[PDB]
Enzyme design. Structure first.
Site, PDB file in Angstrom:
ATOM      1  N   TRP A 121       0.872  -1.167   0.000  1.00  0.00           N
ATOM      2  CA  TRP A 121       0.000   0.000   0.000  1.00  0.00           C
ATOM      3  C   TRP A 121       0.918   1.228   0.000  1.00  0.00           C
ATOM      4  O   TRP A 121       1.678   1.439   0.948  1.00  0.00           O
ATOM      5  CB  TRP A 121      -0.850  -0.026   1.273  1.00  0.00           C
ATOM      6  CG  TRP A 121      -2.008   0.910   1.285  1.00  0.00           C
ATOM      7  CD1 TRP A 121      -2.878   1.149   0.264  1.00  0.00           C
ATOM      8  CD2 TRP A 121      -2.463   1.692   2.394  1.00  0.00           C
ATOM      9  NE1 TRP A 121      -3.852   2.025   0.670  1.00  0.00           N
ATOM     10  CE2 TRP A 121      -3.624   2.373   1.973  1.00  0.00           C
ATOM     11  CE3 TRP A 121      -2.005   1.882   3.701  1.00  0.00           C
ATOM     12  CZ2 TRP A 121      -4.336   3.229   2.814  1.00  0.00           C
ATOM     13  CZ3 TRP A 121      -2.712   2.737   4.541  1.00  0.00           C
ATOM     14  CH2 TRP A 121      -3.866   3.399   4.092  1.00  0.00           C
ATOM     15  N   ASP A 202      -0.923  -5.160   9.448  1.00  0.00           N
ATOM     16  CA  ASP A 202      -1.925  -4.220   8.967  1.00  0.00           C
ATOM     17  C   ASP A 202      -3.148  -5.067   8.641  1.00  0.00           C
ATOM     18  O   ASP A 202      -3.165  -5.787   7.633  1.00  0.00           O
ATOM     19  CB  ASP A 202      -1.418  -3.508   7.702  1.00  0.00           C
ATOM     20  CG  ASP A 202      -2.378  -2.434   7.191  1.00  0.00           C
ATOM     21  OD1 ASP A 202      -3.532  -2.352   7.662  1.00  0.00           O
ATOM     22  OD2 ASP A 202      -1.975  -1.661   6.300  1.00  0.00           O
ATOM     23  N   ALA A 204      -6.764  -4.641   7.664  1.00  0.00           N
ATOM     24  CA  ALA A 204      -7.790  -3.721   7.180  1.00  0.00           C
ATOM     25  C   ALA A 204      -8.996  -4.351   6.486  1.00  0.00           C
ATOM     26  O   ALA A 204     -10.009  -3.681   6.268  1.00  0.00           O
ATOM     27  CB  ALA A 204      -7.153  -2.678   6.271  1.00  0.00           C
ATOM     28  N   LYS A 237     -13.685  -0.694   6.412  1.00  0.00           N
ATOM     29  CA  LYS A 237     -14.269  -1.572   5.418  1.00  0.00           C
ATOM     30  C   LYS A 237     -15.199  -2.661   5.922  1.00  0.00           C
ATOM     31  O   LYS A 237     -16.356  -2.711   5.497  1.00  0.00           O
ATOM     32  CB  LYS A 237     -13.176  -2.164   4.530  1.00  0.00           C
ATOM     33  CG  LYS A 237     -12.425  -1.121   3.710  1.00  0.00           C
ATOM     34  CD  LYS A 237     -10.987  -0.945   4.188  1.00  0.00           C
ATOM     35  CE  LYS A 237     -10.242   0.112   3.364  1.00  0.00           C
ATOM     36  NZ  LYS A 237      -8.801  -0.073   3.469  1.00  0.00           N
TER      37      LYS A 237
HETATM   38  C1  LIG Z   1      -8.047   0.697   4.286  1.00  0.00           C
HETATM   39  C2  LIG Z   1      -6.730   0.374   4.534  1.00  0.00           C
HETATM   40  C3  LIG Z   1      -6.081   0.888   5.687  1.00  0.00           C
HETATM   41  C4  LIG Z   1      -6.779   1.800   6.696  1.00  0.00           C
HETATM   42  O1  LIG Z   1      -7.666   2.784   6.241  1.00  0.00           O
HETATM   43  P1  LIG Z   1      -8.460   3.660   7.230  1.00  0.00           P
HETATM   44  O2  LIG Z   1      -9.490   4.294   6.195  1.00  0.00           O
HETATM   45  O3  LIG Z   1      -7.556   4.694   7.759  1.00  0.00           O
HETATM   46  O4  LIG Z   1      -9.237   2.806   8.136  1.00  0.00           O
HETATM   47  C5  LIG Z   1      -4.803   0.532   5.955  1.00  0.00           C
HETATM   48  N1  LIG Z   1      -4.139  -0.308   5.129  1.00  0.00           N
HETATM   49  C6  LIG Z   1      -4.712  -0.830   4.018  1.00  0.00           C
HETATM   50  C7  LIG Z   1      -3.932  -1.780   3.186  1.00  0.00           C
HETATM   51  C8  LIG Z   1      -5.994  -0.507   3.679  1.00  0.00           C
HETATM   52  O5  LIG Z   1      -6.520  -1.029   2.497  1.00  0.00           O
HETATM   53  O1  LIG Z   2      -7.770   2.208  -2.041  1.00  0.00           O
HETATM   54  C1  LIG Z   2      -7.272   1.793  -0.973  1.00  0.00           C
HETATM   55  O2  LIG Z   2      -6.102   1.374  -0.915  1.00  0.00           O
HETATM   56  C2  LIG Z   2      -8.116   1.818   0.293  1.00  0.00           C
HETATM   57  C3  LIG Z   2      -8.596   3.224   0.686  1.00  0.00           C
HETATM   58  C4  LIG Z   2      -7.481   4.201   1.079  1.00  0.00           C
HETATM   59  C5  LIG Z   2      -6.942   5.021  -0.095  1.00  0.00           C
HETATM   60  C6  LIG Z   2      -5.822   5.979   0.305  1.00  0.00           C
HETATM   61  C7  LIG Z   2      -6.263   6.889   1.453  1.00  0.00           C
HETATM   62  C8  LIG Z   2      -6.770   6.076   2.648  1.00  0.00           C
HETATM   63  C9  LIG Z   2      -7.888   5.136   2.217  1.00  0.00           C
END
Ligand SMILES: *Cc1c(COP(=O)(O)O)cnc(C)c1O
Ligand SMILES: O=C(O)CCC1CCCCC1
Ligand SMILES: *Cc1c(COP(=O)(O)O)cnc(C)c1O
Lengths: 388, 394
Positions: A121, A202, A204, A237
């Protein structure tokens, strides 16, 4: 004074959403057949119950509410939750959890380095860049087979030293969709304990892969093997409360003393950044998690979502097979999560969005959720047309 | 690795309540609280706030990711609430933050980015958290005289003489109104002189606006801020919605960066959005949406303004009673400052030793610096506090 400010680079994924037969396969949010990101039934019921039972809005817990902390600990670690040795911090979304994790770690180890998957990410590196923390990469994605280059991953991971931090995705790897098996997880645990590196997980998408408990199998295995571990969880999510900004950081320690230290540093970390953590979202979460009726309906809706995406993958993969006579794209059905990296080079990726109207992230990361029976054949045809 | 963590001190507030709760005295009084309590000792949810949450529950169809810097409705509504008609949209950058504290932290980060050698000047005394944050960031902290322990008023001459040593690029932190913890405030004429000093020194003013509406009124409380905004080209304002909207736990704040020109505004706005993204991505929506709803819905706004004013008037009447009581007992007007102070807090000017005597002898608890919460007083507790003060010789 402010004129000295330097222009900062924008978030690519968010920008992609900004520049949008349009088919959106960008931002990682769940969408229904009708291109909507709904509010889960239980979440809605929770808010109503909240609007009725809450009599005050005064300051609450600095590290979050006990109920939220407990519910989250149990959801992630199940029965592997050792309260006396775990510290919990309610944060501003999973992102806030990661940042708070990096800060906490650096306090205990000013000379820490962070190993991230190749690829990972983009926000992970961005935050680390901002903080000025040394970033190292470990091989993860196998560009040819679209799976995981486990041999390469183990090689680079062994090169970590005590005090180093290894950032692993608990499941549903963003952006590739390639994930480790439980067997691979056990091996990684062996390497970690041999090197003395601190794993930062992580988490998520717990619930978008193979199931709520299944998606936590890996995190539970590491927690059972490694004495100290950090888990940055997001409720954005799996609860669909993206804008509420709710998640938490769990610090697994070796003993109560250390745990009392971590909890103290974590609280202090919220105090110096924004004081108290946002309440609304954490309340929805614990309310759902502690109300048997709501928990049952939430698990069900999340199940429905997970099952659906899984179908879409098999559908998209099949459409591709019957449009190439080869199971090269088979991996699409093997990948698990919300995303999947196709492999289309930068040349092709931008070409597709241009002469097809389908917007995906430059590295060919597509959001399976942003697809349906109507758009699947179009995407299949698209990647077949622009095969190279 | 985590065992190498240094012990971090508790917030103390808990320890303050710890002793209080352990007190077996039925007549114990708590004036150390830092939030508003009503007649029945409760911190209610404002009517307009409860109304907005009901409307939100009925109209929100999704909770997808929203604005990185906050929602336009909120940014604009807040900008108007603080700067009124004087809002220069073309040169105003705005950022939704996690409470006022988040606004302060971000403002400090923004300034540091623009100037690494930044030094911050804070009043003597000020909200403890101010110093804590700066210390955490490792920013140089300077102090300017403010509270005159003798008159319990502002030591303005000292303030001017100290702010004079500020260099270009230094940051001067001022409380827009209702000085926490003192309660002593600057008059519009003093705000004018301060502005002159800032223009002269080239120091960047950081205005902490957390109690708009608790002083003399919504518009009245922003007077100083608005005067600064018009005289000085660059200004940073960290607003809070915790108290004036009674949404403490929702964590709703706003950072306004007033710039010299559009080019700079875009530069600041970009840096601000970058700051949110690098700390927690998107800011909390709920509290901000309640606020934008109240401010935009004529019915709710009117009711909120009315409830706030009743709260403000209520506290003021209490100040008058306490001061009147104190005058009768002292046979003097020494404590007249109590009715002059504006805000929710007031420093009596008692020493730790005297504060301890009050707790032990009268069972009245307050912060060690003698900061009291006017909201915790009522017709039954005022006579007791009055006598306690006199008996210990404050
Ligand atoms: C969504 C996501 C997060 C965290 O997002 P928040 O909107 O701040 O809850 C962290 N890491 C990954 C890989 C994600 O897809
Ligand atoms: O598209 C993704 O990787 C998940 C959502 C993320 C996109 C970058 C800002 C925080 C939220
Ligand atoms: C309360 C307060 C704040 C902000 O509180 P938040 O809860 O973070 O909104 C900031 N400054 C002062 C002086 C305050 O009294």
């Amino acid at each position: 004074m402010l004129g000295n400010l330097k222009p900062q680079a924008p978030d690519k994924i968010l920008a992609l959403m900004g520049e949008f037969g349009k088919i959106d396969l960008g931002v990682g949010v769940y969408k229904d057949a009708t291109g909507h990101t709904p509010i889960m039934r239980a979440v809605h019921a929770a808010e109503q119950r909240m609007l009725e039972t809450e009599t005050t809005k005064t300051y609450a817990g600095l590290s979050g509410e006990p109920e939220f902390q407990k519910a989250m600990g149990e959801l992630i670690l199940g029965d592997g939750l050792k309260s006396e040795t775990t510290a919990t911090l309610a944060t501003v979304g999973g992102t806030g959890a990661l940042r708070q994790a990096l800060e906490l770690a650096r306090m205990a180890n000013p000379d820490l380095r962070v190993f991230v998957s190749d690829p990972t990410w983009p926000n992970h590196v961005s935050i680390m860049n901002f903080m000025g923390l040394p970033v190292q990469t470990y091989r993860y994605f196998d560009a040819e087979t679209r799976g995981v280059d486990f041999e390469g991953m183990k090689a680079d991971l062994a090169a970590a030293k005590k005090g180093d931090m290894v950032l692993l995705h608990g499941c549903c790897h963003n952006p590739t969709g390639a994930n480790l098996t439980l067997d691979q997880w056990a091996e990684i645990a062996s390497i970690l304990e041999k090197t003395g590196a601190l794993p930062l997980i992580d988490l998520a998408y717990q619930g978008f892969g193979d199931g709520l408990e299944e998606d936590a199998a890996g995190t539970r295995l590491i927690a059972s093997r490694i004495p100290e571990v950090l888990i940055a969880a997001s409720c954005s999510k799996n609860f669909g409360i993206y804008r509420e900004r709710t998640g938490c950081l769990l610090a697994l320690c070796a003993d109560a003393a250390t745990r009392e230290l971590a909890q103290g540093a974590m609280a202090f970390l919220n105090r110096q950044t924004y004081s108290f953590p946002p309440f609304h979202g954490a309340k929805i979460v614990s309310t759902v998690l502690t109300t048997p009726e709501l928990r049952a309906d939430w698990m069900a809706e999340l199940e429905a979502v997970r099952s659906g995406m899984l179908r879409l993958r098999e559908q998209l993969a099949g459409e591709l097979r019957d449009l190439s006579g080869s199971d090269r794209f088979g991996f699409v059905a093997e990948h698990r999560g919300m995303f999947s990296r196709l492999g289309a080079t930068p040349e092709q990726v931008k070409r597709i969005k241009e002469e097809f109207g389908i917007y995906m992230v430059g590295d060919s990361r597509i959001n399976i959720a942003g697809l349906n029976d109507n758009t699947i054949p179009i995407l299949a045809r698209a990647i077949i047309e622009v095969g190279v």
